[PDB]
Structures are given as C-alpha cells and as structure tokens.
PDB file of C-alpha atoms in Angstrom:
ATOM      1  CA  UNK A 188      15.162  32.730 -35.388  1.00 16.46           C
ATOM      2  CA  UNK A 189      15.512  31.499 -31.822  1.00 18.48           C
ATOM      3  CA  UNK A 190      13.500  34.352 -30.434  1.00 18.11           C
ATOM      4  CA  UNK A 191      10.195  33.040 -31.899  1.00 18.43           C
ATOM      5  CA  UNK A 192      10.920  29.411 -30.803  1.00 15.32           C
ATOM      6  CA  UNK A 193      11.183  30.951 -27.372  1.00 14.94           C
ATOM      7  CA  UNK A 194       7.853  32.767 -27.790  1.00 16.03           C
ATOM      8  CA  UNK A 195       6.312  29.340 -28.845  1.00 16.61           C
ATOM      9  CA  UNK A 196       7.823  27.574 -25.741  1.00 17.68           C
ATOM     10  CA  UNK A 197       6.762  30.363 -23.376  1.00 18.41           C
ATOM     11  CA  UNK A 198       3.193  30.337 -24.322  1.00 12.66           C
ATOM     12  CA  UNK A 199       3.084  26.454 -24.321  1.00 12.74           C
ATOM     13  CA  UNK A 200       4.599  26.433 -20.839  1.00 10.27           C
ATOM     14  CA  UNK A 201       1.783  28.779 -19.687  1.00 10.18           C
ATOM     15  CA  UNK A 202      -0.827  26.383 -21.086  1.00 12.61           C
ATOM     16  CA  UNK A 203       0.913  23.491 -19.298  1.00 15.04           C
ATOM     17  CA  UNK A 204       1.136  25.548 -16.053  1.00 10.51           C
ATOM     18  CA  UNK A 205      -2.630  26.315 -16.331  1.00 10.63           C
ATOM     19  CA  UNK A 206      -3.451  22.628 -16.968  1.00 12.40           C
ATOM     20  CA  UNK A 207      -1.356  21.739 -13.965  1.00 13.52           C
ATOM     21  CA  UNK A 208      -2.884  24.188 -11.610  1.00 11.37           C
ATOM     22  CA  UNK A 209      -6.395  23.130 -12.735  1.00 13.63           C
ATOM     23  CA  UNK A 210      -5.384  19.469 -12.064  1.00 14.39           C
ATOM     24  CA  UNK A 211      -4.495  20.319  -8.509  1.00 12.62           C
ATOM     25  CA  UNK A 212      -7.893  19.608  -7.070  1.00 11.91           C
ATOM     26  CA  UNK A 213      -8.899  16.828  -9.436  1.00 11.71           C
ATOM     27  CA  UNK A 214      -9.443  13.285  -8.232  1.00 12.31           C
ATOM     28  CA  UNK A 215      -6.813  10.637  -8.644  1.00 13.05           C
ATOM     29  CA  UNK A 216      -7.375   8.550 -11.976  1.00 12.81           C
ATOM     30  CA  UNK A 217      -5.190   5.710 -10.806  1.00 12.59           C
ATOM     31  CA  UNK A 218      -2.219   5.037  -8.488  1.00 11.27           C
ATOM     32  CA  UNK A 219       1.044   3.145  -9.260  1.00  8.62           C
ATOM     33  CA  UNK A 220       3.851   1.646  -7.476  1.00  8.66           C
ATOM     34  CA  UNK A 221       7.033   2.139  -9.402  1.00  9.98           C
ATOM     35  CA  UNK A 222       9.495  -0.444 -10.474  1.00  9.56           C
ATOM     36  CA  UNK A 223      12.131   1.994 -11.475  1.00 10.80           C
ATOM     37  CA  UNK A 224      13.655   5.252 -10.310  1.00 15.14           C
ATOM     38  CA  UNK A 225      13.338   8.422 -12.414  1.00 15.68           C
ATOM     39  CA  UNK A 226      15.388  11.595 -12.260  1.00 18.50           C
ATOM     40  CA  UNK A 227      14.113  14.776 -14.054  1.00 16.42           C
ATOM     41  CA  UNK A 228      17.320  16.674 -13.352  1.00 14.81           C
ATOM     42  CA  UNK A 229      18.566  16.322 -16.855  1.00 13.68           C
ATOM     43  CA  UNK A 230      15.925  16.939 -19.408  1.00 16.00           C
ATOM     44  CA  UNK A 231      14.044  19.323 -21.655  1.00 14.48           C
ATOM     45  CA  UNK A 232      10.657  18.937 -23.151  1.00 13.08           C
ATOM     46  CA  UNK A 233       9.298  18.805 -19.624  1.00 11.15           C
ATOM     47  CA  UNK A 234       6.008  20.695 -19.906  1.00 11.50           C
ATOM     48  CA  UNK A 235       6.975  23.180 -17.234  1.00 11.89           C
ATOM     49  CA  UNK A 236      10.681  23.487 -16.316  1.00 11.25           C
ATOM     50  CA  UNK A 237      11.449  22.223 -12.819  1.00 12.77           C
ATOM     51  CA  UNK A 238       8.122  20.550 -12.374  1.00 14.02           C
ATOM     52  CA  UNK A 239       8.857  17.034 -13.349  1.00 12.72           C
ATOM     53  CA  UNK A 240       8.471  14.440 -10.603  1.00 10.90           C
ATOM     54  CA  UNK A 241      11.517  12.476  -9.697  1.00 10.31           C
ATOM     55  CA  UNK A 242      10.925   9.271  -7.874  1.00  9.54           C
ATOM     56  CA  UNK A 243      12.648   6.134  -6.544  1.00 10.08           C
ATOM     57  CA  UNK A 244      11.782   2.455  -7.354  1.00 13.99           C
ATOM     58  CA  UNK A 245       8.924   1.417  -5.149  1.00 14.48           C
ATOM     59  CA  UNK A 246       7.477   4.734  -4.677  1.00 20.19           C
ATOM     60  CA  UNK A 247       3.764   5.485  -5.044  1.00 16.53           C
ATOM     61  CA  UNK A 248       2.361   7.951  -7.475  1.00 12.98           C
ATOM     62  CA  UNK A 249      -1.049   9.382  -7.843  1.00 12.63           C
ATOM     63  CA  UNK A 250      -1.957  10.066 -11.626  1.00 10.22           C
ATOM     64  CA  UNK A 251      -4.666  12.619 -12.139  1.00 10.93           C
ATOM     65  CA  UNK A 252      -4.616  13.372 -15.867  1.00 12.70           C
ATOM     66  CA  UNK A 253      -2.927  12.914 -19.282  1.00 11.10           C
ATOM     67  CA  UNK A 254      -0.902  15.851 -20.458  1.00 11.06           C
ATOM     68  CA  UNK A 255       0.325  14.160 -23.510  1.00 12.86           C
ATOM     69  CA  UNK A 256       1.881  10.753 -24.830  1.00 10.85           C
ATOM     70  CA  UNK A 257       5.025  11.638 -22.925  1.00  8.15           C
ATOM     71  CA  UNK A 258       3.811  13.076 -19.539  1.00  6.57           C
ATOM     72  CA  UNK A 259       0.943  12.606 -17.138  1.00  6.88           C
ATOM     73  CA  UNK A 260      -0.017  14.942 -14.364  1.00  7.05           C
ATOM     74  CA  UNK A 261       0.087  13.851 -10.729  1.00  6.10           C
ATOM     75  CA  UNK A 262       2.034  13.567  -7.681  1.00  5.26           C
ATOM     76  CA  UNK A 263       4.500  11.511  -5.520  1.00  4.51           C
ATOM     77  CA  UNK A 264       2.522  10.268  -2.566  1.00  2.73           C
ATOM     78  CA  UNK A 265       4.634  12.059   0.034  1.00  5.16           C
ATOM     79  CA  UNK A 266       3.728  14.661   2.534  1.00  6.20           C
ATOM     80  CA  UNK A 267       4.821  17.847   0.659  1.00  6.36           C
ATOM     81  CA  UNK A 268       4.807  16.809  -3.011  1.00  8.34           C
ATOM     82  CA  UNK A 269       2.517  18.900  -5.100  1.00  7.18           C
ATOM     83  CA  UNK A 270       1.261  18.260  -8.573  1.00  5.36           C
ATOM     84  CA  UNK A 271       3.793  17.905 -11.333  1.00 10.38           C
ATOM     85  CA  UNK A 272       4.658  16.088 -14.534  1.00  9.57           C
ATOM     86  CA  UNK A 273       5.208  12.307 -14.337  1.00 11.51           C
ATOM     87  CA  UNK A 274       6.838  10.596 -17.277  1.00 11.90           C
ATOM     88  CA  UNK A 275       4.597   8.135 -19.083  1.00 13.18           C
ATOM     89  CA  UNK A 276       5.525   4.405 -19.517  1.00 16.09           C
ATOM     90  CA  UNK A 277       6.112   5.150 -23.272  1.00 12.49           C
ATOM     91  CA  UNK A 278       8.558   7.974 -22.320  1.00 15.25           C
ATOM     92  CA  UNK A 279      10.354   5.757 -19.762  1.00 14.12           C
ATOM     93  CA  UNK A 280      10.663   2.888 -22.341  1.00 13.27           C
ATOM     94  CA  UNK A 281      11.940   5.343 -24.975  1.00 13.47           C
ATOM     95  CA  UNK A 282      14.362   6.647 -22.375  1.00  9.96           C
ATOM     96  CA  UNK A 283      15.424   3.060 -21.879  1.00 12.96           C
ATOM     97  CA  UNK A 284      15.944   2.392 -25.580  1.00 14.11           C
ATOM     98  CA  UNK A 285      17.945   5.671 -25.842  1.00 12.46           C
ATOM     99  CA  UNK A 286      20.056   4.436 -22.863  1.00  9.47           C
ATOM    100  CA  UNK A 287      20.574   1.153 -24.636  1.00 11.74           C
ATOM    101  CA  UNK A 288      21.603   2.916 -27.927  1.00 11.75           C
ATOM    102  CA  UNK A 289      24.054   5.160 -25.989  1.00  9.70           C
ATOM    103  CA  UNK A 290      25.409   2.025 -24.425  1.00  9.31           C
ATOM    104  CA  UNK A 291      26.157   0.339 -27.777  1.00  9.68           C
ATOM    105  CA  UNK A 292      27.683   3.557 -29.021  1.00  8.43           C
ATOM    106  CA  UNK A 293      30.356   3.669 -26.354  1.00  3.89           C
ATOM    107  CA  UNK A 294      31.953   0.529 -27.928  1.00  4.94           C
ATOM    108  CA  UNK A 295      33.547  -0.745 -24.723  1.00  5.72           C
ATOM    109  CA  UNK A 296       9.629  -4.167 -18.052  1.00  5.47           C
ATOM    110  CA  UNK A 297       6.625  -2.470 -16.587  1.00  5.67           C
ATOM    111  CA  UNK A 298       7.940   0.592 -14.823  1.00  8.53           C
ATOM    112  CA  UNK A 299       4.537   1.268 -13.173  1.00  6.44           C
ATOM    113  CA  UNK A 300       2.248  -1.497 -11.543  1.00  2.15           C
ATOM    114  CA  UNK A 301      -1.306  -0.280 -10.858  1.00  2.00           C
ATOM    115  CA  UNK A 302      -2.211  -0.131  -7.160  1.00  2.50           C
ATOM    116  CA  UNK A 303      -5.205   0.987  -5.048  1.00  2.00           C
ATOM    117  CA  UNK A 304      -5.096   4.813  -4.561  1.00  2.00           C
ATOM    118  CA  UNK A 305      -4.893   4.133  -0.889  1.00  2.13           C
ATOM    119  CA  UNK A 306      -2.825   1.180   0.466  1.00  5.62           C
ATOM    120  CA  UNK A 307      -5.217  -1.068   2.290  1.00  3.58           C
ATOM    121  CA  UNK A 308      -4.303  -1.544   5.896  1.00  2.00           C
ATOM    122  CA  UNK A 309      -3.885  -5.273   6.808  1.00  2.00           C
ATOM    123  CA  UNK A 310      -3.454  -6.721  10.415  1.00  2.00           C
ATOM    124  CA  UNK A 311      -1.341  -9.701  11.031  1.00  2.00           C
ATOM    125  CA  UNK A 312      -0.698 -11.256  14.415  1.00  2.00           C
ATOM    126  CA  UNK A 313      -0.080 -11.671  17.229  1.00  2.00           C
ATOM    127  CA  UNK A 314      -1.067 -15.190  16.245  1.00  2.00           C
ATOM    128  CA  UNK A 315      -3.509 -16.992  13.863  1.00  2.00           C
ATOM    129  CA  UNK A 316      -6.874 -15.320  13.095  1.00  2.00           C
ATOM    130  CA  UNK A 317     -10.030 -17.401  13.846  1.00  2.00           C
ATOM    131  CA  UNK A 318      -8.619 -17.729  17.445  1.00  2.00           C
ATOM    132  CA  UNK A 319      -9.672 -15.491  20.369  1.00  2.00           C
ATOM    133  CA  UNK A 320      -6.408 -13.768  21.329  1.00  2.00           C
ATOM    134  CA  UNK A 321      -5.660 -12.580  17.757  1.00  2.00           C
ATOM    135  CA  UNK A 322      -9.380 -11.849  16.870  1.00  2.00           C
ATOM    136  CA  UNK A 323     -10.096 -10.053  20.066  1.00  2.00           C
ATOM    137  CA  UNK A 324      -6.766  -8.090  19.904  1.00  2.00           C
ATOM    138  CA  UNK A 325      -7.436  -6.985  16.286  1.00  2.00           C
ATOM    139  CA  UNK A 326     -11.081  -6.124  16.992  1.00  2.00           C
ATOM    140  CA  UNK A 327      -9.883  -3.753  19.695  1.00  5.08           C
ATOM    141  CA  UNK A 328      -7.484  -1.985  17.011  1.00  6.86           C
ATOM    142  CA  UNK A 329     -10.359  -1.899  14.427  1.00  5.67           C
ATOM    143  CA  UNK A 330     -12.759  -0.318  16.906  1.00  5.89           C
ATOM    144  CA  UNK A 331     -10.249   2.378  17.702  1.00  6.50           C
ATOM    145  CA  UNK A 332      -9.388   3.201  14.080  1.00  3.86           C
ATOM    146  CA  UNK A 333     -13.176   3.481  13.235  1.00  2.16           C
ATOM    147  CA  UNK A 334     -13.297   6.166  16.023  1.00  2.65           C
ATOM    148  CA  UNK A 335      -9.997   7.998  15.476  1.00  4.25           C
ATOM    149  CA  UNK A 336     -10.527   8.158  11.726  1.00  5.97           C
ATOM    150  CA  UNK A 337     -14.306   8.346  11.577  1.00  7.49           C
ATOM    151  CA  UNK A 338     -15.248  10.108   8.396  1.00  9.84           C
ATOM    152  CA  UNK A 339     -12.008   9.210   6.645  1.00 11.09           C
ATOM    153  CA  UNK A 340     -12.030   5.417   7.012  1.00  9.65           C
ATOM    154  CA  UNK A 341     -13.576   2.399   5.549  1.00  8.12           C
ATOM    155  CA  UNK A 342     -13.058  -0.862   7.353  1.00  7.49           C
ATOM    156  CA  UNK A 343     -14.260  -3.963   5.582  1.00  7.29           C
ATOM    157  CA  UNK A 344     -14.279  -7.734   6.083  1.00  5.65           C
ATOM    158  CA  UNK A 345     -12.564  -9.847   3.416  1.00  2.00           C
ATOM    159  CA  UNK A 346     -13.432 -13.541   3.896  1.00  2.00           C
ATOM    160  CA  UNK A 347     -12.212 -14.352   0.243  1.00  2.21           C
ATOM    161  CA  UNK A 348      -8.668 -15.569   0.148  1.00  3.36           C
ATOM    162  CA  UNK A 349      -7.088 -12.547  -1.427  1.00  2.00           C
ATOM    163  CA  UNK A 350      -3.633 -14.346  -1.085  1.00  4.00           C
ATOM    164  CA  UNK A 351      -4.585 -16.011  -4.398  1.00  5.97           C
ATOM    165  CA  UNK A 352      -4.705 -12.639  -6.024  1.00  5.27           C
ATOM    166  CA  UNK A 353      -1.195 -12.801  -7.661  1.00  5.72           C
ATOM    167  CA  UNK A 354      -1.026 -10.080 -10.246  1.00  6.88           C
ATOM    168  CA  UNK A 355      -0.292 -12.396 -13.264  1.00  9.12           C
ATOM    169  CA  UNK A 356      -3.108 -14.781 -12.299  1.00  7.70           C
ATOM    170  CA  UNK A 357      -5.638 -11.946 -12.391  1.00  6.75           C
ATOM    171  CA  UNK A 358      -4.372 -10.408 -15.793  1.00  9.70           C
ATOM    172  CA  UNK A 359      -4.658 -13.877 -17.436  1.00 13.94           C
ATOM    173  CA  UNK A 360      -7.522 -13.767 -19.973  1.00 13.60           C
ATOM    174  CA  UNK A 361      -7.114 -17.406 -20.893  1.00 13.33           C
ATOM    175  CA  UNK A 362     -10.061 -19.820 -20.116  1.00 10.73           C
ATOM    176  CA  UNK A 363      -7.477 -22.528 -19.695  1.00  9.39           C
ATOM    177  CA  UNK A 364      -5.832 -20.868 -16.698  1.00  8.91           C
ATOM    178  CA  UNK A 365      -8.319 -22.657 -14.427  1.00  9.39           C
ATOM    179  CA  UNK A 366      -6.851 -26.125 -15.265  1.00  9.70           C
ATOM    180  CA  UNK A 367      -3.554 -25.001 -13.725  1.00  9.08           C
ATOM    181  CA  UNK A 368      -5.201 -24.242 -10.284  1.00  8.32           C
ATOM    182  CA  UNK A 369      -4.823 -27.489  -8.391  1.00  3.71           C
ATOM    183  CA  UNK A 370      -7.407 -27.493  -5.623  1.00  4.47           C
ATOM    184  CA  UNK A 371      -8.487 -23.886  -5.308  1.00  7.90           C
ATOM    185  CA  UNK A 372      -9.019 -22.287  -2.034  1.00  8.67           C
ATOM    186  CA  UNK A 373     -11.791 -19.775  -2.851  1.00  6.00           C
ATOM    187  CA  UNK A 374     -12.767 -18.882  -6.454  1.00  6.05           C
ATOM    188  CA  UNK A 375     -10.409 -16.750  -8.575  1.00  6.09           C
ATOM    189  CA  UNK A 376     -13.443 -14.859  -9.836  1.00  6.62           C
ATOM    190  CA  UNK A 377     -14.524 -13.999  -6.348  1.00  6.75           C
ATOM    191  CA  UNK A 378     -10.996 -13.055  -5.471  1.00  5.52           C
ATOM    192  CA  UNK A 379     -10.841 -10.711  -8.562  1.00  3.53           C
ATOM    193  CA  UNK A 380     -14.215  -9.291  -7.714  1.00  5.21           C
ATOM    194  CA  UNK A 381     -12.867  -8.607  -4.174  1.00  6.20           C
ATOM    195  CA  UNK A 382      -9.619  -7.030  -5.367  1.00  6.17           C
ATOM    196  CA  UNK A 383     -11.727  -4.629  -7.522  1.00  7.33           C
ATOM    197  CA  UNK A 384     -13.809  -3.931  -4.457  1.00  9.03           C
ATOM    198  CA  UNK A 385     -10.722  -2.867  -2.572  1.00  8.58           C
ATOM    199  CA  UNK A 386      -9.534  -0.582  -5.482  1.00  7.09           C
ATOM    200  CA  UNK A 387     -12.923   0.985  -5.458  1.00  5.49           C
ATOM    201  CA  UNK A 388     -13.210   1.651  -1.813  1.00  7.60           C
ATOM    202  CA  UNK A 389     -10.064   3.605  -1.886  1.00  4.03           C
ATOM    203  CA  UNK A 390     -10.790   5.536  -5.125  1.00  5.87           C
ATOM    204  CA  UNK A 391     -11.785   8.603  -3.105  1.00  2.00           C
ATOM    205  CA  UNK A 392      -8.675   8.567  -1.076  1.00  4.60           C
ATOM    206  CA  UNK A 393     -10.390   7.477   2.215  1.00  2.95           C
ATOM    207  CA  UNK A 394      -8.271   5.074   4.404  1.00  3.43           C
ATOM    208  CA  UNK A 395      -9.048   1.576   3.718  1.00  3.17           C
ATOM    209  CA  UNK A 396      -8.622  -1.213   6.284  1.00  2.00           C
ATOM    210  CA  UNK A 397      -9.060  -4.836   5.452  1.00  4.43           C
ATOM    211  CA  UNK A 398     -10.168  -7.413   8.005  1.00  4.69           C
ATOM    212  CA  UNK A 399      -8.677 -10.164   5.942  1.00  7.91           C
ATOM    213  CA  UNK A 400      -9.442 -13.594   7.504  1.00 10.03           C
ATOM    214  CA  UNK A 401      -6.900 -15.593   5.452  1.00 11.48           C
ATOM    215  CA  UNK A 402      -3.886 -13.280   5.849  1.00 12.31           C
ATOM    216  CA  UNK A 403      -1.659 -14.305   8.812  1.00 11.42           C
ATOM    217  CA  UNK A 404       1.723 -13.519   7.124  1.00 12.32           C
ATOM    218  CA  UNK A 405       2.826 -10.569   4.767  1.00 13.67           C
ATOM    219  CA  UNK A 406       4.303 -12.892   2.133  1.00 11.95           C
ATOM    220  CA  UNK A 407       0.709 -13.980   1.327  1.00 14.20           C
ATOM    221  CA  UNK A 408      -0.086 -10.536  -0.165  1.00 14.17           C
ATOM    222  CA  UNK A 409       3.383  -9.399  -1.633  1.00 15.83           C
ATOM    223  CA  UNK A 410       2.694 -10.904  -5.108  1.00 16.53           C
ATOM    224  CA  UNK A 411      -0.695  -9.122  -5.224  1.00 16.24           C
ATOM    225  CA  UNK A 412      -1.561  -5.845  -6.581  1.00 15.28           C
ATOM    226  CA  UNK A 413      -2.834  -4.407  -3.258  1.00 15.15           C
ATOM    227  CA  UNK A 414       0.368  -2.999  -1.999  1.00 13.65           C
ATOM    228  CA  UNK A 415      -1.079  -3.203   1.578  1.00 12.06           C
ATOM    229  CA  UNK A 416       0.116  -1.400   4.574  1.00 12.10           C
ATOM    230  CA  UNK A 417       0.879  -4.523   6.785  1.00 12.63           C
ATOM    231  CA  UNK A 418       0.547  -3.789  10.498  1.00 13.88           C
ATOM    232  CA  UNK A 419       2.165  -6.340  12.751  1.00 13.62           C
ATOM    233  CA  UNK A 420       0.599  -6.791  16.066  1.00 14.40           C
ATOM    234  CA  UNK A 421       3.558  -8.294  17.892  1.00 15.45           C
ATOM    235  CA  UNK A 422       3.629  -9.950  21.353  1.00 16.47           C
ATOM    236  CA  UNK A 423       7.341 -10.014  22.119  1.00 15.81           C
ATOM    237  CA  UNK A 424       7.483 -12.730  24.829  1.00 17.57           C
ATOM    238  CA  UNK A 425       6.070 -16.267  23.793  1.00 15.79           C
ATOM    239  CA  UNK A 426       5.515 -17.007  27.508  1.00 15.01           C
ATOM    240  CA  UNK A 427       3.067 -13.944  27.455  1.00 16.34           C
ATOM    241  CA  UNK A 428       1.281 -15.330  24.394  1.00 13.06           C
ATOM    242  CA  UNK A 429       0.971 -18.827  25.846  1.00 13.00           C
ATOM    243  CA  UNK A 430      -0.528 -17.402  29.074  1.00 14.17           C
ATOM    244  CA  UNK A 431      -2.948 -15.083  27.186  1.00 11.67           C
ATOM    245  CA  UNK A 432      -4.156 -18.094  25.151  1.00 10.25           C
ATOM    246  CA  UNK A 433      -4.592 -20.176  28.315  1.00 12.59           C
ATOM    247  CA  UNK A 434      -6.583 -17.331  29.884  1.00  9.91           C
ATOM    248  CA  UNK A 435      -9.188 -18.090  27.258  1.00  6.40           C
ATOM    249  CA  UNK A 436     -10.051 -21.460  28.451  1.00  4.80           C
ATOM    250  CA  UNK A 437      -9.414 -25.125  27.666  1.00  6.15           C
ATOM    251  CA  UNK A 438     -10.900 -25.086  24.110  1.00  4.81           C
ATOM    252  CA  UNK A 439      -8.651 -22.188  22.886  1.00  5.69           C
ATOM    253  CA  UNK A 440      -5.766 -23.645  24.855  1.00  5.33           C
ATOM    254  CA  UNK A 441      -6.028 -27.020  23.039  1.00  3.32           C
ATOM    255  CA  UNK A 442      -4.669 -25.172  19.992  1.00  3.10           C
ATOM    256  CA  UNK A 443      -1.863 -23.573  21.942  1.00  3.24           C
ATOM    257  CA  UNK A 444       0.685 -25.272  19.684  1.00  2.00           C
ATOM    258  CA  UNK A 445      -0.482 -24.071  16.307  1.00  2.13           C
ATOM    259  CA  UNK A 446      -1.161 -20.684  17.698  1.00  2.00           C
ATOM    260  CA  UNK A 447       2.607 -20.499  18.976  1.00  2.00           C
ATOM    261  CA  UNK A 448       3.804 -21.707  15.597  1.00  2.00           C
ATOM    262  CA  UNK A 449       2.132 -18.856  13.632  1.00  2.00           C
ATOM    263  CA  UNK A 450       3.402 -16.375  16.137  1.00  2.00           C
ATOM    264  CA  UNK A 451       6.957 -17.559  15.776  1.00  2.00           C
ATOM    265  CA  UNK A 452       6.579 -17.595  11.979  1.00  8.01           C
ATOM    266  CA  UNK A 453       5.761 -13.951  12.021  1.00  7.42           C
ATOM    267  CA  UNK A 454       8.590 -13.427  14.570  1.00  5.69           C
ATOM    268  CA  UNK A 455      11.075 -14.783  12.058  1.00  4.37           C
ATOM    269  CA  UNK A 456       9.734 -12.700   9.170  1.00  3.00           C
ATOM    270  CA  UNK A 457      12.218 -10.002   8.147  1.00  4.76           C
ATOM    271  CA  UNK A 458      11.143  -6.472   9.592  1.00  4.26           C
ATOM    272  CA  UNK A 459      11.096  -5.128   6.066  1.00  3.95           C
ATOM    273  CA  UNK A 460       7.920  -7.164   5.265  1.00  2.22           C
ATOM    274  CA  UNK A 461       5.910  -5.059   7.545  1.00  2.00           C
ATOM    275  CA  UNK A 462       5.002  -1.414   7.314  1.00  3.61           C
ATOM    276  CA  UNK A 463       4.290  -1.045  11.082  1.00  2.00           C
ATOM    277  CA  UNK A 464       5.054  -3.049  14.145  1.00  2.00           C
ATOM    278  CA  UNK A 465       2.910  -2.586  17.212  1.00  2.31           C
ATOM    279  CA  UNK A 466       4.843  -4.351  20.004  1.00  2.00           C
ATOM    280  CA  UNK A 467       3.410  -2.073  22.770  1.00  2.00           C
ATOM    281  CA  UNK A 468       2.124  -3.852  25.922  1.00  2.00           C
ATOM    282  CA  UNK A 469      -0.841  -1.237  26.199  1.00  2.00           C
ATOM    283  CA  UNK A 470      -3.701  -1.083  23.676  1.00  2.00           C
ATOM    284  CA  UNK A 471      -3.600   2.704  24.121  1.00  6.67           C
ATOM    285  CA  UNK A 472       0.007   2.893  23.104  1.00  8.60           C
ATOM    286  CA  UNK A 473      -0.402   0.511  20.065  1.00 10.32           C
ATOM    287  CA  UNK A 474      -3.447   2.635  19.037  1.00  9.44           C
ATOM    288  CA  UNK A 475      -1.477   5.875  19.230  1.00  6.65           C
ATOM    289  CA  UNK A 476       1.405   4.393  17.299  1.00  7.83           C
ATOM    290  CA  UNK A 477      -0.958   3.155  14.664  1.00  7.28           C
ATOM    291  CA  UNK A 478      -2.827   6.510  14.468  1.00  7.30           C
ATOM    292  CA  UNK A 479       0.467   8.499  14.115  1.00  9.61           C
ATOM    293  CA  UNK A 480       1.442   6.298  11.238  1.00  6.93           C
ATOM    294  CA  UNK A 481      -1.986   6.465   9.489  1.00  7.27           C
ATOM    295  CA  UNK A 482      -2.040  10.300  10.149  1.00  6.53           C
ATOM    296  CA  UNK A 483       1.216  10.714   8.338  1.00  7.88           C
ATOM    297  CA  UNK A 484       0.026   8.494   5.574  1.00 10.23           C
ATOM    298  CA  UNK A 485      -3.152  10.711   5.341  1.00 12.02           C
ATOM    299  CA  UNK A 486      -0.881  13.691   4.991  1.00 14.04           C
ATOM    300  CA  UNK A 487       1.194  11.966   2.326  1.00 15.83           C
ATOM    301  CA  UNK A 488      -1.922  11.238   0.275  1.00 16.49           C
ATOM    302  CA  UNK A 489      -3.690  14.582   0.903  1.00 19.18           C
ATOM    303  CA  UNK A 490      -2.447  17.946   2.356  1.00 21.83           C
ATOM    304  CA  UNK A 491      -2.810  21.590   1.143  1.00 21.78           C
ATOM    305  CA  UNK A 492      -4.030  21.746  -2.505  1.00 19.48           C
ATOM    306  CA  UNK A 493      -7.453  19.855  -2.325  1.00 23.73           C
TER     307      UNK A 493
ATOM    308  CA  UNK B   7       7.978  -7.153  32.679  1.00 24.19           C
ATOM    309  CA  UNK B   8       6.038 -10.267  32.063  1.00 27.53           C
ATOM    310  CA  UNK B   9       3.493  -9.250  34.562  1.00 27.10           C
ATOM    311  CA  UNK B  10       3.475  -5.781  32.901  1.00 26.87           C
ATOM    312  CA  UNK B  11       3.051  -7.354  29.357  1.00 26.04           C
ATOM    313  CA  UNK B  12       0.291  -9.680  30.546  1.00 26.62           C
ATOM    314  CA  UNK B  13      -1.751  -7.112  32.382  1.00 21.39           C
ATOM    315  CA  UNK B  14      -1.651  -4.857  29.468  1.00 20.02           C
ATOM    316  CA  UNK B  15      -2.396  -7.626  26.932  1.00 20.87           C
ATOM    317  CA  UNK B  16      -5.249  -8.962  29.141  1.00 20.01           C
ATOM    318  CA  UNK B  17      -7.114  -5.581  29.376  1.00 18.13           C
ATOM    319  CA  UNK B  18      -6.411  -5.145  25.529  1.00 16.46           C
ATOM    320  CA  UNK B  19      -8.164  -8.514  25.051  1.00 15.74           C
ATOM    321  CA  UNK B  20     -11.238  -7.305  27.124  1.00 14.38           C
ATOM    322  CA  UNK B  21     -11.431  -4.287  24.924  1.00 15.12           C
ATOM    323  CA  UNK B  22     -11.896  -6.799  22.047  1.00 15.20           C
ATOM    324  CA  UNK B  23     -15.019  -8.466  23.476  1.00 14.12           C
TER     325      UNK B  23
END
C-alpha cells in the first residue's frame, strides 16, 4: 500500500541525492538571469526534499546538469548557496498554467534569459572614453585588477559596438533583419561574434573585465544579454573634472565641453543602473572598493564545494 | 576638499600613463 510507495520514493531520493553530490564539482553548463521569482516552500516531487532552489526575479543561477524534464541541478549565485534543484522552464510554465486554471476556478514569457557565467565588468566614467582623463583613469584601474586578481581574471579589449547587441536582434534568424538596420555602427555579425567571445571567456568562472570603447553609459548594455557589472568611476565635482582635463593640455581641453556633458549624463543616471560607484578621490581607495566588490562576487560564484 | 580631490585624481592619472 503506502509503505511500498515510500520505499520507491526513498530509493529515488537517494539516487537524486547522489546525482546532486556528484554534480557539486561539475562545471557550469550555462547561467541565467531570472525574470520570475520561484518559491519551493510548497511542493512535492522535488527530487530531494528541502533541496529546491528558491530565487527572486533578476537573480543569477548557474545550471550544471539536467536531472529530468522538470528539474535541473545548479545553484543560486550567492555566497553560501550550494547545489540544489532548479525548476526547468517547462515546469515553471506548467506552474503558470496551473496557477491560471486555479484562477479561473475561483469564479470571482521566458522565465530565464541566458547570461555569461560570469557577469563582465564594464567601466564607465568619469567622462567619455577616447579622451585622456577617462582613459588614463580606467587604465589605472585595469592595471590594478590584473594584479589583484592575477590568475582569476581575464581583461579584454572590446572595440566592437556591443551596445547593438540587443537580445532580440541577435536571436533573429531572418536574412531580412539587415534591411531594418539604418546605418549600422559596426557589423551585427562582428557584434554577435564578440558577445560569444565574452560568454566563452567566462565559461570557466574566471572574472571577466571588458575594456569596452563604445560604452559610456549603462543604458547602452541593458538590452543586451551580457548582464554586466557596471562600475561607475565618478568624479563628484565638475570643477575637479574641468581642471583635470585642462591639466592634459590645450588639445584635450578643446573638448572640455563634450567631456563635461558625458560626465553630467552619467551623473543624472539613476544609481540603480550601476553595480558599483567608485567616487573615491584616491586610486588606492577606489581600487580597494572595487576589489572588495569583486572578491565578494568571486565568493558568490565559487566558495567551498569546488 | 577640491584641492584634495584634485591632488588624488592627478596622481591617479599619472598611474594611468
């Protein structure tokens, strides 16, 4: 009767437990940013009781392996989350239909977006790239990161305009899509190639840092599939920026005006569009701030198991 | 505080040469 159903569920739990444990040290198959929240609190046929992964919308998940059509094995990208069971999109959509059927009975779109397995770090500010103050100030930060995270870091130049890398544009198989692109910046093929280059650089869970020439503002990457960590190098006083640009001679100074415009553009950007804001006066202090953030990220994406 | 900002930011720039 019920005692043999319990024997079947007990052994099966043990198989799942074993799969789960074996998957602990496995590489990440892919990453997702979630579009929906999921709570495991109230359900059965979860492969191992208490082991389902609950998550909020906009959380990042690392998927390691397929358990079955309903469940994958992976983890919430968060310092102490261990492996667990994540509901597949099919399950989540079935849960949505069941919720809709319940709703009718009262008689009163993609849950997961694929993302790089490590969020690429992007630097914006204090002003426009291709000018000396911003370029020199970012170079300093890039040199530090190469040192502080040597062995765990990949810093790469991206000249291609990855701002054109809107997710829908890149999924579009149609050979007619090109006739919609008024003057293109760079080529969408090259952009796609470059996006896959970034996904690939992060596949082994090393920190990825992009030196992205075309990105001066977070809104240029928000529609993309990169889910970057956007680090805002902020000079708080415009008077300071003006003087810094003037320190670089008459040529640089001739474009004081555009430079101050971009700076002010970033300055009115909502704080929520950035992941980190480095407004420290001293390189050493900004560097430490950035390292603390990236070290915690490292811990979110690795800690004890591997 | 402007002199502080400037001096720190100036040496930061020099580190980016």
